[PDB]
Amino acid sequence: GYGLGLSTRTQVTGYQFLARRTAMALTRWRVRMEVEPGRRQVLAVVASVSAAGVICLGALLWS
Amino acid sequence: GYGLGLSTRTQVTGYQFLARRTAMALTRWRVRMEVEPGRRQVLAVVASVSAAGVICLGALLWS
Amino acid sequence: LVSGSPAVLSAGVAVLVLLPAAGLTAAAVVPNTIYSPLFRKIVEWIEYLCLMPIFPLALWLMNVYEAIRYR
Amino acid sequence: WMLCLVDGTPLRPNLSLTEQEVYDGDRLWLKFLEDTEHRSEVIEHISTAVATNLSKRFAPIDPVVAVQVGAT
Amino acid sequence: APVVKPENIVLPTPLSVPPPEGKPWWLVVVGVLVVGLLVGMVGMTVASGSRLFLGAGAIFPIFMIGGVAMMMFGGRFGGQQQMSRPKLDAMRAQFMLMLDMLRETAQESADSMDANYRWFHPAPTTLAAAVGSSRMWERQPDGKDLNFGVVRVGVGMTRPEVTWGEPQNMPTDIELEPVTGKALQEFGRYQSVVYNLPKMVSLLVEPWYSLVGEREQVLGLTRAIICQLAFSHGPDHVQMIVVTSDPDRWDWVKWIPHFGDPRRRDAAGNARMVYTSVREFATEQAELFAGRGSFTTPTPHHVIISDIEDPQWEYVISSEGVDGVTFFDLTGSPLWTGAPQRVLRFTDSAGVIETLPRDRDTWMVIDDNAWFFALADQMSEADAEQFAHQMAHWRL
Amino acid sequence: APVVKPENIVLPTPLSVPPPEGKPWWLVVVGVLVVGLLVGMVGMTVASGSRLFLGAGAIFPIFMIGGVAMMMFGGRFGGQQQMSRPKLDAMRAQFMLMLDMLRETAQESADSMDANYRWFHPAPTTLAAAVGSSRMWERQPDGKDLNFGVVRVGVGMTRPEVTWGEPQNMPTDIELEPVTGKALQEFGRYQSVVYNLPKMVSLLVEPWYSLVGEREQVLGLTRAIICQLAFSHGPDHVQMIVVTSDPDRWDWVKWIPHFGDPRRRDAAGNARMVYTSVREFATEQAELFAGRGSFTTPTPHHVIISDIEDPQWEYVISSEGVDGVTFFDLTGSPLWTGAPQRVLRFTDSAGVIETLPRDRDTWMVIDDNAWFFALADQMSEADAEQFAHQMAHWRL
């Protein structure tokens, strides 16, 4: 499966899962994956960015 | 079944399916049809047209 | 040709020499490399996203919006 | 067995050398034509028949061609 | 030798679909009223013109934000529901791919049958190989007897070795989905037969055959038959007789060793078993047999060919024939045409044989109505003579 | 001695997933209309500018406070539903951990098999132990006979003692989840074999072997074979013969007691059973046997090695061989290479043997196609001589 051929969304999540599992195998040296703090803290990053965006919009409404 | 005889909606979709399958057999040379980008991009066209219509209505409300 | 700006000339010759060269590099690289399903889905969606906005832009060019706002 | 012209075409066995224009100093090729008779396939479904006929009979794009197109 | 195998494949069951019942009349009235309200509201916003009213008149009726979900209640209240389409289209595609898998299985089976049949039954032109595969069929009632007494006469349809098991659980004809139903109809119709295989006549099931049509069609077929038998069967198993009024058309047969009479010798070798009249039967050795029983093996199986048009056959030939001898009546007459299962009729100028449909296996007639049978493998006099000059080279 | 055990383990069933049907076209129109309304409302709030309208235009459309729950109706109306992801990812992880447990079970099984095989089949270099474990294999057809007539020739793959039971209830190929399906494919592919175990040739199943390749590859392998047999089997069970045109390459074998002829004595002890020609067979004792039947035990099992390249072998050697004697044809010739299952072909410079795949248990050929078999345990002349100087020390 070379090239830019099409892919299904179930493959997109399947790859993202294997990427996270490989990242956990890289930073830690365990692959038991029943809980994963990597996701939790990138969600915390997402919360930071979305909060900055929201406050930026709340700043736009003043004139 | 000549002429302008009546037809059921299940036949309308059945014909439209055979039309799409024949179109895919024409442009590509495969008929495995589990996913079909033809539909996806004509939906993108429909999105373009409906967005133009919507903005045209949003333009009408000014006076 | 219409504009006499040397900056326009430089941009034109730059795109003429890079863009088909980029196409050549894509033709050489892409059939041999593997790719991630995410990048493949991104490349699909690039099509629809570049396809969708051309009708409002077309109506911009006809100034249908400006005609109908004042009719 | 067929006698053939060097360009490839088999001669008519019911015709002589003369009326199919064999002349002195010509050359001929002695082939054994394999029998080409076999069952005619049949695909009932129009879409599948289109797809297989095109795929069998024309040539797809290929990266060998693609690199030449990019160079052009 | 090639291989062939029977198979049995059940066809898949077509899709089912409940017919739409149709919306009740009040629903149309309600729809028109709803549109009337919508246009009345927006109209009174245009007539009132203040931007507050233009806001309010759109803000309060935004219901589609839920109604896009509430469409699911369409199947509860009985509104129009076009939205099941994607699932049905997926079901259609799936069924179709299954049918394709069956079709390719039929293709490979038909290819195997073709390879086998043409190995057993080469085309007349190709018989000029004349060595290696020549005269290799055998007397004894096992094995080669499945093709010992059978001759390729043409090309045409036959039933495949795959057997289509019934598509059980067919939905009723109002529930039957149009696409999958029609596709399955077409599959059953066209995968019913393999096209352009060798069509065969068994010499062991009819006392004679009678050949009705144009003279050169009939002759060309007869030469093809003779050369097929001469290649496939040795002179020790099948002997040949031609009874004719026009020996110039039959002058080529002198080279074929099967026409050699072992009993009379001349300068050229064995006597040619070609006679100019049925009265010219000075054999009397093929005419002391009893009536013929169709096989279900005589030492030579004599094949007597007649285009003499003589009323004297009906004396030595009863209604049932002679034991070890099969006959071929050229120039079809009412004496020989008394059995339509024996009449091979050139219906079209190209040499389209019609006759009765026979079972591929038993060669027994399946039904009495005449139908397309084959296009005849007609062969020219020059090709026949050329093959005869090949066959004359051998004496084994 | 070590232990090994067969096992049978059914592989787990991969996950199944229904393919998405795809949203209908009207849903896209509705979505665009909804966005059009939203932007129209906020735009008219900006155009109206009064803080009341700016409040109202956000206050009334707050629907997401319920819509976050009402997402559950997406599966009813057929909208996009990405939210099942966490459960599927948990299922994936769970299946993967189960597969890991199976993998470690395979690892421990393969370690047991390795320990056993290398105990039975030490590497040629390690044979210099020459005491304790030396000559300990036994004639009698039980027990040690599983390794009495078998020789380590190289290293390579073998099938494990765990047996992978089928992953029953496989979903159909459209329902098959990509990750778990692919992982199971890879498990079946790679846990199919244990890598770098001793590869064995049984002397009891072929009448001879013929060694095709470069001269020093072939010789090095032959020296390895000889020293393996000399360590593993005593002189009373296996005797050895070398027939050569180049005795300098074979001068080291004089020390090995297995080459000692018990019948002729000289100053150095027993006569060396090394001959310079097949005509130089003044034995005649290994040449009064019958043809050979492959085992499924003779008093000494003579191993005769030839690199003489003499046409005279085909006289005393039929197509089937001699009873108690196995042969090794160095310098591969068409006389000895008449059986591909007997030809060990150095395909790569390192000494990659290809030959036919044989059953681990019966040593019988499983299929006729030549394939990778082993990398040969080639051994130098100095190591062979050193081992011979060790083995010469013993007389038991």
Short mmCIF file of all heavy atoms in Angstrom, two decimals, chain F residues 125-168:
data_model
loop_
_atom_site.label_atom_id
_atom_site.label_comp_id
_atom_site.label_asym_id
_atom_site.label_seq_id
_atom_site.Cartn_x
_atom_site.Cartn_y
_atom_site.Cartn_z
N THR F 125 32.39 -26.56 16.39
CA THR F 125 33.47 -26.04 17.22
C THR F 125 33.43 -26.60 18.63
O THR F 125 34.47 -26.95 19.20
CB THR F 125 33.40 -24.51 17.25
OG1 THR F 125 33.25 -24.02 15.91
CG2 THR F 125 34.66 -23.94 17.85
N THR F 126 32.24 -26.72 19.20
CA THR F 126 32.08 -27.15 20.58
C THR F 126 32.31 -28.64 20.79
O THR F 126 32.38 -29.08 21.94
CB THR F 126 30.69 -26.77 21.09
OG1 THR F 126 29.72 -27.55 20.40
CG2 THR F 126 30.42 -25.30 20.84
N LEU F 127 32.42 -29.42 19.71
CA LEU F 127 32.60 -30.87 19.82
C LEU F 127 33.93 -31.26 20.45
O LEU F 127 34.09 -32.42 20.84
CB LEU F 127 32.48 -31.52 18.45
CG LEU F 127 31.18 -31.27 17.68
CD1 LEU F 127 31.24 -31.95 16.32
CD2 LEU F 127 29.99 -31.77 18.48
N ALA F 128 34.88 -30.33 20.56
CA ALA F 128 36.16 -30.56 21.23
C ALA F 128 36.05 -30.92 22.71
O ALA F 128 37.08 -31.14 23.34
CB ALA F 128 37.05 -29.33 21.07
N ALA F 129 34.84 -30.93 23.29
CA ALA F 129 34.67 -31.48 24.63
C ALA F 129 35.10 -32.94 24.69
O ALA F 129 35.79 -33.35 25.63
CB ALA F 129 33.21 -31.33 25.07
N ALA F 130 34.70 -33.73 23.69
CA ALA F 130 35.22 -35.07 23.40
C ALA F 130 35.13 -36.07 24.56
O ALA F 130 35.75 -37.13 24.49
CB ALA F 130 36.67 -34.99 22.91
N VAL F 131 34.37 -35.77 25.61
CA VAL F 131 34.23 -36.68 26.74
C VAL F 131 32.95 -36.33 27.48
O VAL F 131 32.47 -35.19 27.42
CB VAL F 131 35.48 -36.61 27.66
CG1 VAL F 131 35.50 -35.31 28.47
CG2 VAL F 131 35.57 -37.83 28.57
N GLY F 132 32.36 -37.32 28.14
CA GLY F 132 31.17 -37.10 28.93
C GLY F 132 29.91 -37.31 28.13
O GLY F 132 29.11 -38.21 28.43
N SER F 133 29.72 -36.49 27.11
CA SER F 133 28.59 -36.59 26.20
C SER F 133 28.95 -37.27 24.89
O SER F 133 28.11 -37.35 23.99
CB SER F 133 28.02 -35.20 25.92
OG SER F 133 26.83 -35.27 25.16
N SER F 134 30.18 -37.76 24.76
CA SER F 134 30.65 -38.29 23.49
C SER F 134 30.15 -39.71 23.26
O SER F 134 30.06 -40.52 24.19
CB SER F 134 32.18 -38.28 23.44
OG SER F 134 32.64 -38.86 22.23
N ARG F 135 29.81 -39.99 22.00
CA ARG F 135 29.42 -41.31 21.50
C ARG F 135 28.23 -41.91 22.25
O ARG F 135 28.14 -43.13 22.39
CB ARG F 135 30.60 -42.27 21.54
CG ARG F 135 31.80 -41.81 20.75
CD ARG F 135 32.98 -42.70 21.06
NE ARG F 135 34.18 -42.31 20.34
CZ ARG F 135 35.34 -42.94 20.44
NH1 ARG F 135 35.45 -44.01 21.22
NH2 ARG F 135 36.39 -42.52 19.75
N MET F 136 27.33 -41.07 22.73
CA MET F 136 26.31 -41.55 23.67
C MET F 136 25.03 -41.98 22.98
O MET F 136 24.08 -42.38 23.66
CB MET F 136 26.00 -40.48 24.72
CG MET F 136 25.19 -39.30 24.23
SD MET F 136 24.95 -38.09 25.55
CE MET F 136 24.02 -36.82 24.69
N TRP F 137 24.97 -41.91 21.65
CA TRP F 137 23.77 -42.33 20.94
C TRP F 137 23.77 -43.83 20.67
O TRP F 137 24.82 -44.46 20.57
CB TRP F 137 23.61 -41.54 19.64
CG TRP F 137 23.66 -40.10 19.94
CD1 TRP F 137 24.71 -39.26 19.73
CD2 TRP F 137 22.70 -39.35 20.69
NE1 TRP F 137 24.43 -38.01 20.21
CE2 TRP F 137 23.20 -38.04 20.81
CE3 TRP F 137 21.45 -39.65 21.23
CZ2 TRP F 137 22.50 -37.03 21.45
CZ3 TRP F 137 20.75 -38.65 21.87
CH2 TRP F 137 21.28 -37.36 21.98
N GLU F 138 22.56 -44.38 20.55
CA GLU F 138 22.36 -45.82 20.66
C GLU F 138 21.69 -46.39 19.42
O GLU F 138 20.87 -45.74 18.76
CB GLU F 138 21.50 -46.15 21.89
CG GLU F 138 22.24 -46.06 23.20
CD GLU F 138 23.33 -47.11 23.33
OE1 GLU F 138 23.21 -48.19 22.72
OE2 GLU F 138 24.31 -46.85 24.06
N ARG F 139 22.06 -47.64 19.13
CA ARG F 139 21.55 -48.38 17.98
C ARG F 139 20.04 -48.53 18.01
O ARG F 139 19.36 -48.30 17.00
CB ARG F 139 22.19 -49.77 17.96
CG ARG F 139 23.55 -49.88 17.32
CD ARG F 139 23.42 -49.72 15.81
NE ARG F 139 22.93 -50.93 15.14
CZ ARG F 139 23.49 -52.14 15.14
NH1 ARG F 139 24.67 -52.37 15.71
NH2 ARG F 139 22.88 -53.13 14.50
N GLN F 140 19.50 -48.94 19.16
CA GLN F 140 18.21 -49.62 19.22
C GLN F 140 17.06 -48.70 18.83
O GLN F 140 17.07 -47.51 19.15
CB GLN F 140 18.03 -50.22 20.62
CG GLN F 140 18.01 -49.24 21.79
CD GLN F 140 16.66 -48.63 22.05
OE1 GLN F 140 15.63 -49.24 21.78
NE2 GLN F 140 16.65 -47.42 22.60
N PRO F 141 16.06 -49.23 18.10
CA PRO F 141 15.08 -48.37 17.40
C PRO F 141 14.17 -47.53 18.29
O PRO F 141 13.31 -46.82 17.76
CB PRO F 141 14.25 -49.38 16.60
CG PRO F 141 15.18 -50.52 16.38
CD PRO F 141 15.96 -50.63 17.65
N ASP F 142 14.30 -47.58 19.61
CA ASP F 142 13.53 -46.73 20.50
C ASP F 142 14.45 -45.67 21.10
O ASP F 142 15.67 -45.85 21.16
CB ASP F 142 12.87 -47.56 21.61
CG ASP F 142 11.83 -46.78 22.38
OD1 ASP F 142 11.43 -45.69 21.91
OD2 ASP F 142 11.41 -47.25 23.45
N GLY F 143 13.86 -44.56 21.52
CA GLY F 143 14.63 -43.55 22.23
C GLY F 143 15.62 -42.81 21.37
O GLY F 143 15.25 -41.93 20.58
N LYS F 144 16.91 -43.14 21.54
CA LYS F 144 18.00 -42.48 20.84
C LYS F 144 17.90 -42.60 19.32
O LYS F 144 18.54 -41.81 18.61
CB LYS F 144 19.36 -43.05 21.27
CG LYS F 144 19.91 -42.58 22.63
CD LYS F 144 19.21 -43.20 23.82
CE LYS F 144 19.92 -42.85 25.12
NZ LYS F 144 19.23 -43.44 26.31
N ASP F 145 17.13 -43.56 18.81
CA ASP F 145 16.94 -43.70 17.37
C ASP F 145 16.29 -42.47 16.75
O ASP F 145 16.45 -42.23 15.55
CB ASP F 145 16.11 -44.94 17.08
CG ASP F 145 15.99 -45.24 15.60
OD1 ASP F 145 17.01 -45.63 14.99
OD2 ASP F 145 14.88 -45.10 15.05
N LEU F 146 15.57 -41.67 17.55
CA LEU F 146 15.06 -40.40 17.07
C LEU F 146 16.19 -39.45 16.68
O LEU F 146 15.97 -38.52 15.91
CB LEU F 146 14.18 -39.73 18.13
CG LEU F 146 12.70 -40.13 18.27
CD1 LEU F 146 11.94 -39.76 17.00
CD2 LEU F 146 12.48 -41.60 18.63
N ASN F 147 17.39 -39.69 17.21
CA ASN F 147 18.56 -38.90 16.86
C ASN F 147 19.78 -39.77 16.56
O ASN F 147 20.89 -39.23 16.49
CB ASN F 147 18.86 -37.91 17.98
CG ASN F 147 17.97 -36.67 17.90
OD1 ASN F 147 18.22 -35.77 17.11
ND2 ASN F 147 16.89 -36.67 18.67
N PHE F 148 19.61 -41.08 16.41
CA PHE F 148 20.76 -41.94 16.12
C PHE F 148 21.28 -41.71 14.71
O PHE F 148 22.49 -41.61 14.50
CB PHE F 148 20.40 -43.41 16.32
CG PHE F 148 21.46 -44.36 15.85
CD1 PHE F 148 22.66 -44.46 16.54
CD2 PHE F 148 21.27 -45.15 14.73
CE1 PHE F 148 23.65 -45.33 16.12
CE2 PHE F 148 22.25 -46.02 14.30
CZ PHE F 148 23.44 -46.11 15.00
N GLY F 149 20.39 -41.66 13.72
CA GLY F 149 20.84 -41.59 12.35
C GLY F 149 20.79 -40.20 11.77
O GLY F 149 20.90 -40.04 10.55
N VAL F 150 20.60 -39.19 12.61
CA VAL F 150 20.36 -37.82 12.18
C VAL F 150 21.61 -37.00 12.50
O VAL F 150 22.31 -37.28 13.48
CB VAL F 150 19.08 -37.21 12.81
CG1 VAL F 150 19.33 -36.61 14.16
CG2 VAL F 150 18.46 -36.21 11.86
N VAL F 151 21.96 -36.08 11.61
CA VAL F 151 23.15 -35.26 11.79
C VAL F 151 22.76 -33.79 11.64
O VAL F 151 21.99 -33.42 10.75
CB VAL F 151 24.28 -35.65 10.81
CG1 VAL F 151 23.84 -35.57 9.36
CG2 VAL F 151 25.50 -34.76 11.03
N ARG F 152 23.25 -32.96 12.56
CA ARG F 152 23.18 -31.52 12.39
C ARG F 152 24.05 -31.09 11.22
O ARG F 152 25.24 -31.39 11.18
CB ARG F 152 23.64 -30.83 13.67
CG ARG F 152 23.87 -29.34 13.50
CD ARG F 152 24.34 -28.73 14.80
NE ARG F 152 24.71 -27.34 14.63
CZ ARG F 152 24.72 -26.45 15.61
NH1 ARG F 152 24.44 -26.82 16.85
NH2 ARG F 152 25.07 -25.19 15.37
N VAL F 153 23.44 -30.39 10.27
CA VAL F 153 24.17 -29.91 9.10
C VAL F 153 24.29 -28.39 9.08
O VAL F 153 25.25 -27.86 8.49
CB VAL F 153 23.49 -30.43 7.82
CG1 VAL F 153 22.05 -29.97 7.77
CG2 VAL F 153 24.25 -30.06 6.54
N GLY F 154 23.44 -27.67 9.79
CA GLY F 154 23.47 -26.23 9.70
C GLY F 154 22.55 -25.60 10.72
O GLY F 154 22.16 -26.24 11.70
N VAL F 155 22.21 -24.34 10.48
CA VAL F 155 21.18 -23.68 11.26
C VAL F 155 20.14 -23.05 10.35
O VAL F 155 20.42 -22.70 9.20
CB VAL F 155 21.78 -22.62 12.20
CG1 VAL F 155 22.45 -23.30 13.39
CG2 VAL F 155 22.79 -21.79 11.45
N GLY F 156 18.94 -22.90 10.88
CA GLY F 156 17.83 -22.44 10.07
C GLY F 156 16.53 -22.47 10.85
O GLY F 156 16.52 -22.64 12.07
N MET F 157 15.44 -22.31 10.12
CA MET F 157 14.10 -22.28 10.68
C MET F 157 13.62 -23.68 11.05
O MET F 157 14.07 -24.68 10.48
CB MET F 157 13.11 -21.68 9.68
CG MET F 157 13.51 -20.33 9.16
SD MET F 157 12.18 -19.58 8.20
CE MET F 157 12.30 -20.53 6.69
N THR F 158 12.68 -23.75 11.99
CA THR F 158 11.82 -24.91 12.11
C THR F 158 10.48 -24.50 12.71
O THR F 158 10.36 -23.46 13.35
CB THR F 158 12.46 -26.01 12.97
OG1 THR F 158 11.69 -27.21 12.86
CG2 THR F 158 12.54 -25.59 14.41
N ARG F 159 9.48 -25.33 12.46
CA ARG F 159 8.17 -25.14 13.07
C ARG F 159 8.19 -25.39 14.58
O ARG F 159 8.85 -26.33 15.04
CB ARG F 159 7.14 -26.02 12.37
CG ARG F 159 7.40 -27.49 12.45
CD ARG F 159 6.32 -28.28 11.74
NE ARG F 159 6.62 -29.70 11.75
CZ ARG F 159 6.42 -30.51 12.78
NH1 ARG F 159 5.86 -30.05 13.89
NH2 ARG F 159 6.74 -31.79 12.68
N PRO F 160 7.53 -24.54 15.36
CA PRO F 160 7.53 -24.70 16.82
C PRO F 160 6.73 -25.92 17.27
O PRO F 160 5.99 -26.54 16.51
CB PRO F 160 6.88 -23.41 17.30
CG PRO F 160 5.99 -23.02 16.20
CD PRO F 160 6.72 -23.39 14.95
N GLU F 161 6.90 -26.24 18.55
CA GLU F 161 6.11 -27.27 19.20
C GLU F 161 4.73 -26.77 19.61
O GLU F 161 3.80 -27.58 19.72
CB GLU F 161 6.81 -27.81 20.45
CG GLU F 161 7.88 -28.87 20.23
CD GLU F 161 7.31 -30.25 19.92
OE1 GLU F 161 6.67 -30.43 18.87
OE2 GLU F 161 7.54 -31.17 20.74
N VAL F 162 4.57 -25.47 19.83
CA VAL F 162 3.23 -24.92 19.89
C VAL F 162 2.59 -25.00 18.52
O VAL F 162 3.24 -24.78 17.49
CB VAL F 162 3.24 -23.47 20.42
CG1 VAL F 162 3.48 -23.46 21.91
CG2 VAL F 162 4.27 -22.65 19.71
N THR F 163 1.31 -25.34 18.50
CA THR F 163 0.52 -25.41 17.29
C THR F 163 -0.58 -24.36 17.38
O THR F 163 -1.38 -24.36 18.32
CB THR F 163 -0.08 -26.80 17.11
OG1 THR F 163 0.97 -27.77 17.19
CG2 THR F 163 -0.76 -26.91 15.76
N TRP F 164 -0.62 -23.48 16.39
CA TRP F 164 -1.59 -22.39 16.39
C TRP F 164 -2.92 -22.90 15.89
O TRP F 164 -3.11 -23.13 14.70
CB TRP F 164 -1.06 -21.24 15.54
CG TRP F 164 0.24 -20.72 16.05
CD1 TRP F 164 1.41 -20.67 15.37
CD2 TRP F 164 0.51 -20.20 17.36
NE1 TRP F 164 2.40 -20.14 16.17
CE2 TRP F 164 1.87 -19.84 17.39
CE3 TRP F 164 -0.27 -19.98 18.51
CZ2 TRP F 164 2.46 -19.29 18.52
CZ3 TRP F 164 0.33 -19.44 19.62
CH2 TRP F 164 1.68 -19.10 19.62
N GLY F 165 -3.85 -23.10 16.82
CA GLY F 165 -5.22 -23.37 16.44
C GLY F 165 -5.83 -22.17 15.72
O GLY F 165 -5.49 -21.02 15.99
N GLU F 166 -6.70 -22.48 14.76
CA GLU F 166 -7.30 -21.49 13.88
C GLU F 166 -8.01 -20.39 14.67
O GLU F 166 -8.71 -20.69 15.65
CB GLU F 166 -8.29 -22.17 12.93
CG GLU F 166 -8.92 -21.27 11.86
CD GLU F 166 -8.01 -20.96 10.68
OE1 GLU F 166 -6.77 -21.06 10.79
OE2 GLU F 166 -8.56 -20.61 9.61
N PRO F 167 -7.85 -19.14 14.29
CA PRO F 167 -8.74 -18.10 14.80
C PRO F 167 -10.14 -18.24 14.24
O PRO F 167 -10.50 -17.59 13.26
CB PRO F 167 -8.06 -16.81 14.34
CG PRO F 167 -7.37 -17.19 13.07
CD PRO F 167 -6.92 -18.62 13.27
N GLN F 168 -10.94 -19.11 14.86
CA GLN F 168 -12.31 -19.34 14.45
C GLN F 168 -13.15 -18.07 14.56
O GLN F 168 -12.78 -17.10 15.23
CB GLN F 168 -12.93 -20.44 15.30
CG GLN F 168 -13.01 -20.09 16.76
CD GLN F 168 -13.46 -21.25 17.61
OE1 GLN F 168 -13.85 -22.29 17.09
NE2 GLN F 168 -13.41 -21.08 18.92
#
